[PDB]
Amino acid sequence: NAMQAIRSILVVIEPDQLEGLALKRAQLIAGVTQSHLHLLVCEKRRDHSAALNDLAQELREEGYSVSTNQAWKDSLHQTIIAEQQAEGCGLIIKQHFPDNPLKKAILTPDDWKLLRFAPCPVLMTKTARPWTGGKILAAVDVGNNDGEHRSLHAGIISHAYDIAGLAKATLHVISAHPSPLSETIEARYREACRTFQAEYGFSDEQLHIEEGPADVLIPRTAQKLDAVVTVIGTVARTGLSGALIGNTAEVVLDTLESDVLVLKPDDIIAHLEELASK
């Protein structure tokens, strides 16, 4: 019940866009989990206090626990992470607004800095489709069961399952294992796969076991299922020079048309919490 355990959600509110999907997803989640909503506008110039008060009043009348703030220091991603630290939020929800209408799935450079440094789960909303009744896709690699991958996969499945339940949606899993006596090593992999299926109670129809590059297999499955949310984890160990997202998550985040919930390994979250608390 990973989502039920999140007791406050940071909702990034845009002042000038015609969609408000960050708050719509926050209302759906908190309507079930009774989580607190902290609404943040990141801007220095205009005084948004009256509009934030009116929005908070309307949500409290609907039964939500709500606080609001307007802040600005240095950059958009730094303002968001500083607010997450001040309010102790366990999830950040932000809507994706692409810089180029001909490259609509590409995240902005500031979105990438938010995903790199956030010391908590980040939900990047990329579609206006409602979650209710849709398909939720979890991305794992059943071919690896070391302590670090077991923990990360358990978190990806816990969050994806809680989302499927609160949205009255169906849950699907994509396992993309790199292409490789070949029949015997395949037995160890088939063993890992059958154990994963029993441990997590997945039907054959829910579990997509595919061989090939994860960076293209994850988006293909999301597109074929018309998934509305994809849950992914960043790489178990950082690459050189602080490259902690990893190539698979970099490509998938810039390609998916679904919303994306980005989780990080516990050891990476702990180090990012230290950096954010400086």
Residues that bind Cl ion (CB under 5 A): 24, 28, 67-68, 116, 130-131, 243-245
Residue number, 36 or 172, with CB nearest to Cl ion:
36
- Two tokens, residue 275: 């950096």
CB of 24 to Cl ion, least distance (A): 5
Residue number, 164 or 245, with CB nearest to Cl ion:
245
CB of 189 to Cl ion, least distance (A): 29
CB of 235 to Cl ion, least distance (A): 9
CB of 209 to Cl ion, least distance (A): 28
Residue number, 28 or 51, with CB nearest to Cl ion:
28
Whole-angstrom distance, CA of residue 67 vs CA of residue 50: 13
CB of 18 to Cl ion, least distance (A): 17
Residue number, 225 or 272, with CB nearest to Cl ion:
272
- Two tokens, residue 149: 């991958």
Degrees (nearest 5) of the Cα angle 245, 160, 171?
125
Residue number, 28 or 216, with CB nearest to Cl ion:
28
